[model samples]
Target: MIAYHTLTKALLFPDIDQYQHWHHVAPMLAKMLVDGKYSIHQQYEYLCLFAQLVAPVLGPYPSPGRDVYRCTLGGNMTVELSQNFQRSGSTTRIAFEPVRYQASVGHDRFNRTSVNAFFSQLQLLVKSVNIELHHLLSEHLTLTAKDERNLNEEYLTNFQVKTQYVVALDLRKTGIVAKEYFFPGIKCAATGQTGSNACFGAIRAVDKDGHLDSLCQLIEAHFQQSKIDDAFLCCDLVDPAHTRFKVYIADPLVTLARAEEHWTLGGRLTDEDAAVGLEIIRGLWSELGIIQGLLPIMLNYEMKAGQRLPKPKLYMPLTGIPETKIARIMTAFFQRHDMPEQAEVFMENLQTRYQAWLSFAYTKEKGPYLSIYYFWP
Candidate 1:
């Protein structure tokens, strides 16, 4: 016989304390039962109810079998707080937010026909995955095959999904510290370009059940502490030379430099302060590495043979920017370069590449790209 305590400790809480409260509740309820007040059958039912109530808090209950339960829950309590732990606990809520920008390259002397073809292929690919993912999820969760098929069909017939591509970048390197400004700017960009107003409204919406808020809080808290050395987040619309980009360069580095200058001007720099500055610079380097790595991957993925890739409109070096100097190099770059127009051919190329990437990434076989919830507008 498998021991649930072993399972819960091993699989559930090996890292942190996010779900400690929920774990504590389980044993407390089990202890509450009167001696022999509940038979084995009654005990099982009671436990199921207990698990369900705690499911949202602790996350999805592991499968009911003793071995499955044991294997899933057995872990150090600290593990429960990690994002991976939460993902393992709940499958339904694991979905990521969709990208929100509607971007395309305009037809030009350099590349027209190839770009249009790419977009056409991408659109088809997106549609196919949308159908397959919905079907897969419906079948996995529904108990009856008939019910699964019915739900899948209904979903396919009614739902529409959309796809928006975004460039992923490391935040620490960019020096973006405030969520309020960053998130709103992203939303504004999405609205202005795509004509899809309030794309992030769903993310901000609060429901009666509080599920959305809880999910957001959980994600926020997890990232707040995780601080992986080179961690990065994706964004849908960002101008390479935007003021925001410059601000990113200035924020942390300028703060560190100023602190040191103040200390040096008065006397000597403290070991503690020097150490902090070193750590911040290290993080910035890691961020730069991430961007360097991602740029090639994105370009290759989006641009195909016989197609001209979109030229980066802006480039800002990490070094040489001051805290108070906001409108220096970035202003010059933006003023000199106009927004690139989207060629029908280039749009086609992007569409194709995006669709192909989605099909492979999502393992879906049918439907429009926009039909999937993750990609939908």
Candidate 2:
């Protein structure tokens, strides 16, 4: 016949992929740390260590169960064996022995306390992460900056570098990256209104076989053609409205809105005037193989008593290029210019894509769902 005795077991298991996923979760948890919601001691002692568990390769992934502890009742037994000194009548010698016991009974209780704290912190973090991430993604994908300087430098550099690379890869041919270049001067000859002076400058190789020459030729051609108004080219030069060939070159990568203001010397122009300027630049860049589409032109004029001369000024910036391509181009530019600082800016912007995960871990509604332990099981 056999008799059954109580048994206790301690087991360890690990999964590398799971460890990595948890590690990725650290930043989200850190974002969840909130004031007055959780104790600083708890945050430092528990959450901090929990973060370590999921830290990158150099961290806790290798030692998943290294820090786990089990508070078992069996470890608290009493069994006396020997006495160091002679005992008196009041002192009786006794042996103390420890017995095996399971800690499973207390696990649920501990977990409840830990989970509650974790959720509270997570709620606050999620809201902040979500807002930050959404804003970042929107900025990265949009071309709404009025000033190219305000635009992230990394983006500009990337654009230049990528364009060069693409050109080199597709040598002996000119490829166009659509861009809206801004100018300050030139309005609709038909109306004395300010127009979009912003030109869509296309960087292209002049030689079918050489990229540099093609780019230069394209720039020069557009500069020259831009000065001649179709009306002036067809009629006599005696007309005061005859388009005068003027070359105004500033930073080639300025935004249309800023370019108009800068070039116009802060003069106000009508929307129609700005539209005409945009159209002219578009057409000129297209002719130079800088752009692929034909842009519509707008002209504006103000009728003065007995005066037929229409002074044109101002330009608008507009384009149809996708944001990813823009990012690539900006990255290329930075590489070519050797701008490492700007490169960092681009990387940060790109990382904004992970904001959603951060948000989920911190927001109030879902914060309670995350586990808060010093180490993973």
Candidate 3:
């Protein structure tokens, strides 16, 4: 597992005999991270630990009970590098899927021991990094089983539910994990039925008035009532003063239809920030008119305490767009924001291949950042 990191960076351009997939581009991205003073190398170490923890069960592939489901194109684990269009820093996120082995085909393959060990090692890693592990409030714990007997509904059993691991590396420049600016760790969630999946979600200053608490509850209920199955609540403490709350809805069509109405209500918008934020969203929505036919848009809201408006992040899936058109749009996007250098490099190296997802984080000041994710299966 330790060797994977060194070896991946060494390869530079992996799987050169065929088309360059994410695995091929990831090392280059990692190299770029190192050049730019990002945390890709340290993140590689944590990724190895994750692999070791899940190996005993998911380690073996196409074996007895778990038959015929070979590991996906990118292997059991994958890497994604997201560039901050507004800032010089970049974020590295690792997405781990036990379903790569179809480990659940056997259904009972992973027992209490493996699960216990998995969490044990995970906790150790979290502590070693000096970062705190936070849990989601009970109301937001939607993907896990409520009781012991309902095991089938667990994420370990159902691979189709989109319940998986997504952890971002700590973005602070120093080794010390600070409570301010940014706090990153293995962020996870399980979005499956009861008795099947488990939920892992946050930590922040206590909301004394239950303002954030009740608001989260209301938003969750709205998602359920509206039949927005792909929606989930996410919480992150980006700074000591406020906790960042997110309503991640992967279904674009429904969200766009009710976004203006629901986001404000769900977010419990209060004043000036609300109007400013909505203007940005409306502008973005109108700009996306050219691509409205593209189904399955992704929308999420960022609600924070001490902030009156809930910010919105609109993600446009670039998978279906034509290459030429994509280049033109992305080029214009970066150039408009004075990111000519980034636009040049991206066009020269990455844009030609995997254009996963691009998102805009709109705040009251209109200081939006473009987060670009390049993923592999």
Candidate 4:
């Protein structure tokens, strides 16, 4: 048996009270749960699923150490919260990666038995959805037949899941309203790796095989219409009646410039905040010593009352950047927007622990323009 208590405590915060101080998004997310709307316990209940989802894929949990998270498939979960993106609105998204465990066991390099059982569980999880994820990915599974060959386990990159919720002071209810899964290996099939060319190949395959009304086809159509060739996309399912197609573009500059246009197409409103945020970032690029280029940005086309609205957000890499520089950059942005209190709280959160901020994603929001993401160091 796995020590889920220790696992949850080490990775996902054990106590919301202390976690709220370590994580910037926890307080806002915790409030939504306690308000008699979403239920306080229900929030961590779903979060506990992360370990459940990871265990089958990786088999037994490895011994705990400084890098326990790394041993568990070399992936981590991220807490995403937008403070002022909309009026009285905050959106929280918890995203994580589940990769196949690569280790030697007797004659095999992986726990092949567990891998087979893992797919069975995964297939059943998304059975109701119309997306052909299982059909599209069955080739990766190892079968009992001796003659059959499965895709090389090395090429089986990773899968990502983002659980999202909408909470506002005025709204009557909310929960895990949306969940999205991303398969990078679909693109990896073309070249035994995933990249721009592989993504384009996978996308073309989607265009060729998807039906006109199918969720994959609708998203492929959007890709064609927008001429967004260099990107990875995912099928977002709200329900049987409502489906969404989200794209993650490789370049932040292009995403920032065209975000307004994309939001308008989906009938969602936007202002110069995204553009202004980019300006703010570029201004401090040298001061912060940011080396690696900007991370990818995402545009999720989701349905509101009737219209499918596009929500755009960008990612900032903090892997190599120093802690003081990160604090300086965040403080500068908050103070510039006349949000000193927010800045103070954020700084306080930064100083609570020794682990550096891994990366953060943000939209065009004011109170907190970014969602601070943490990783085990």
Candidate 5:
């Protein structure tokens, strides 16, 4: 419900179309799908700067706000042309593609509730001109010492794969766009959890069986488009999954700044960029108020004391409160006592005091303290 979309370009692989060598392109596509920097796992949600070592797990999915894709893989993950929708209708070509696809699925029987929940949604997506697919093998669902040390068996194993041809949806749709999703609440296949719900507002456009069939034709047409008189149509299986190696990718900010050589934007972060980043950090510090020091003075009116309480900011204004209002901030102990008797009054007093402190005028012309940065690496 709280996701933010920013500027983004659907990734493109134009040269593949130019050479028309989709055969050569398939494995690379498959590899990228699994282990490439721009591959689905690494690229979905926000452009990432980190690579996660995943098990053969498909996803924690259900999406939000439109966009859906269905996938089938043959050769090494090439698109023969998905949903060309010519219709004798129009020439404008409203295109679609699997921004990311992977050969991973949840294998835990208990997970089928969610797993089925995931695919049931996929059965509803449309076509893409640039569909992506990957090959994965459940055989690689090997456990590591760290995995054992840090994760529950089913959770780590839930990151396991089930059937073949899994669809990876944009995490943004799955609630990864919100700050909370980045922190603790949201589930992720990357960290061994599932999406909390099916992404909301799936575009109703691409409906059922007909959409699936159109995707099938897109493959056949790709062969002809590739100029192959009779393309062998290197086929994998509906039963088999993919992978021999692995890959990890970072967020785009890091991808642009420090991704490894094998990664898509590997090594692109620059020295000047670092200086600019530090400058921005300083500017942000300038804009906000802060509690400058930590010390406690007693609020001694028939009150019990605690080891901690808010001390005022360094050079900011200060105010005194009456004993009745000094009791504004509630601790759990107070909640059990006065809550039933005075909850509204407690909250009202707390609100007024907070707004007053939080809205006081800013007095910093520059800063009495200096802003400094030292980078050795």
Candidate 6:
């Protein structure tokens, strides 16, 4: 909710008392954009917009650290800060490049630095919305049994499956909006090892008289015939050994998993310099980790023995940067985040936050140097 951001602003800018102004703030933002200033009425709306944008990712209890503005996403990831920031005048320009942490193990194949891969299990947590649980596992898992060539019916039927089923349902219906899926969290399924319920799962239901027998047949057919060995499908349903969803969440696996919950039917990854979507989620998840964990976040800095040192860097101190430059830089930043409309709105908001910038343009001394100030007291 907007509560997340307002309460945060209150913490950093307590005298403003945004907590009381929360709901009243958003609606007036359009007016401020039009006028290049917030009336006491529109100022409330100004705070509300930022609160709305920041709340979901960080929650209502956002507090600032040395680098990050907020943390704690109810997950193992973090909303880290860029090592440095840049701000340019009246509504000064600003830029942020997230910093990464230093760790002994450093980053792995997934590009997760040792700072991130502290656990090294490559955990994934996806709350799929559209697809069912059973199929999701098969679609992602590519683990194969050591030797599935000669395995016949006798050995297959006796084989027991080990995995969690949708405690809410049986092995017929699949999950649409349920937390159901398999993850071989922290294991070398290609070799042999299993641990932790690091994933959420659901059921793959059948008709009236569905039994383990029907499910077993599915496993047998895949084991001997399929090339990549989708036998992990057997782990999703109850095995008559195969009790658990032994299916592995692939790498470079981390504490975060992206699936239906974070996606829509046509949701896509975006980039300005380069195109990406999931990376944004991953970075958000890391920010969560920073808030909930002890590590201070740092990104976009140089790396040493596989990890980078913790440091807070800013592109610019928003207070002194130029308004026109601020508009240019902030506009591009939001565009890169796949929010052109929001970007436009946010730029207007940033400039409105410090109105004297525009006022400076009309003053006597105006050329390369403009007095930029947007302080709402």
Candidate 3: segments with Cα more than 4 A from true spot = 1-81, 98-166, 170-211, 217-230, 237-243, 252-295, 347-352, 364-366
Give the per-residue lDDT of model 4 (tens digit) for 44-95: 5433443344233432233334222222111232223222212233333443
Backbone N/Cα/C clashes per model? 55, 64, 11, 0, 33, 82
**Model 2: residue 33 alpha-carbon error in angstroms:** 27
Which model is ahead, 4 or 5, in terms of lDDT? Answer: 4
lDDT of each: 0.23, 0.24, 0.44, 0.39, 0.22, 0.26
Best by lDDT: 3
What TM-score would each prediction reach against the true structure? Answer: 0.18, 0.17, 0.60, 0.49, 0.19, 0.20
By TM-score: ranked, best first: 3, 4, 6, 5, 1, 2
Worst 10 residues of 2 by lDDT: 163-172
Model 4 lDDT-worst window of ten: 162-171
TM-score of 3: 0.60
Cα RMSD (Å) per model? 25.2, 31.4, 7.8, 9.5, 26.7, 20.6
Candidate 5: Cα lDDT at 52: 16
Residue-wise C-alpha lDDT for candidate 1, range 175-291, written one tens digit per residue: 211111111222222233211112112233212243344333332332224321111212222221111210110112223333223212223223443344334334332333212
Off by over 4 Å in 2: 1-318, 352-377
lDDT of 5 by residue, 1-377 (tens): 01111111323323322223222322232322232123243334222211111111222121233222222122122121111001111010001112222322323322213323433333333222111111122111222234335544332232222222223232222221100001111122224532111110010111222322332333224323433221001111122122011111112221211212211112222234323333432332233322232211111000001211111111111123232432343222134433232334335445411111211101123211111111111
Encode model 3's per-residue lDDT on 290-368: one tens digit a residue: 3543346666666566644445566766655555665666666666666676567557644324556667665535445
User: What's the candidate order when arranged by decreasing lDDT?
Assistant: 3, 4, 6, 2, 1, 5
The window of 10 residues in a row where model 6 has the poorest summed lDDT is: 307-316
